[PDB]
């Protein structure tokens, strides 16, 4: 019943020519609702979900202005970081930023975050108390000192506990039809002989939302991890997710195995067993 709003920002430098590639995406729980791609023609923050289209021109003009300001900040950061790390201007580098807020079932502030990374590694991150910073190395250290003097945390904290939560609640309300609905996974099992003596049982969970889910195999009532395979949760492409768990068993012994599916959309977990 808990929820969250998140923004992801990626900027990749292009030393050979031009400015960094900049891509921003916004999410409410597991639903992307906005996006900006410096490579796009519009040069505008664009809607990705129907319920955000309700927003008027002032909203789109404002989000566009701010997302562009973000891209420019990343542009400067790539330069600054290149200096901090005493790196050549010849190579392409990456900066990433993510921030957001979480609310509980009562839609009250639960926690906020703001993290940054350079070339795929942690650079600096706001502590959960939203009062301090976690700097990974000395380059981040100087950034940390700079941000303490400018009181960046104080400003972020107000956003995370104020505007962030306030708009998350607005979105959840405007997109209630999908955002406040859970899609329980559609489950079934498939049988795939691997030899005349062994067979693979695959337990499928499909078209579910949100993405969080747990698939577990049990053999005669007890969890089994050996001879099992769990693929990472993946998007179906229509807003929902998929996942499957498999176990190799001796042919003829299929009935000993059960697949257990846990998901927020299920009152109680589901149990599947091969016919």
């Amino acid at each position: 019943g808990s929820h969250s709003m998140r923004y992801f920002f990626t900027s990749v430098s292009r030393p050979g020519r031009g400015e960094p590639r900049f891509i921003a995406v916004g999410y409410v729980d597991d639903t992307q609702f906005v996006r900006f791609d410096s490579d796009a023609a519009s040069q505008r923050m664009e809607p990705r979900a129907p319920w955000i289209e309700q927003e008027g021109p002032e909203y789109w003009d404002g989000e566009t202005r701010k997302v562009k300001a973000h891209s420019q900040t990343h542009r400067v950061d790539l330069g600054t970081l290149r200096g901090y790390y005493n790196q050549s201007e010849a190579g392409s580098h990456t900066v990433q930023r993510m921030y957001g807020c979480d609310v509980g079932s009562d839609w009250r502030f639960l926690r906020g975050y703001h993290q940054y990374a350079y070339d795929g590694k942690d650079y600096i991150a706001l502590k959960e108390d939203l009062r301090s910073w976690t700097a990974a190395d000395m380059a981040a250290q100087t950034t940390k000192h700079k941000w303490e003097a400018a009181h960046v945390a104080e400003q972020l904290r107000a956003y995370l506990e104020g505007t962030c939560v306030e708009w998350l609640r607005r979105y959840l309300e405007n997109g209630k039809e999908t955002l406040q609905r859970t899609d329980a996974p559609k489950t079934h099992m498939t049988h795939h002989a691997v030899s005349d003596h062994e067979a693979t049982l695959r337990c499928w969970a499909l078209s579910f939302y949100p993405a969080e889910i747990t698939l577990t195999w049990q053999r005669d009532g007890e969890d089994q991890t050996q001879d099992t395979e769990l693929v990472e949760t993946r998007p179906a492409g229509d807003g929902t997710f998929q996942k499957w768990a498999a176990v190799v068993v001796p042919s003829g012994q299929e009935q000993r195995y059960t697949c257990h599916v846990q998901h927020e959309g299920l009152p109680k977990p589901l149990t599947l067993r091969w016919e």
Binding site: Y7, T73, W167
Partner: peptide
């Protein structure tokens, strides 16, 4: 809704 400002590193 995005954060209004963004300080550089």
């Amino acid at each position: 809704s995005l954060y209004n400002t963004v300080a550089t590193l």
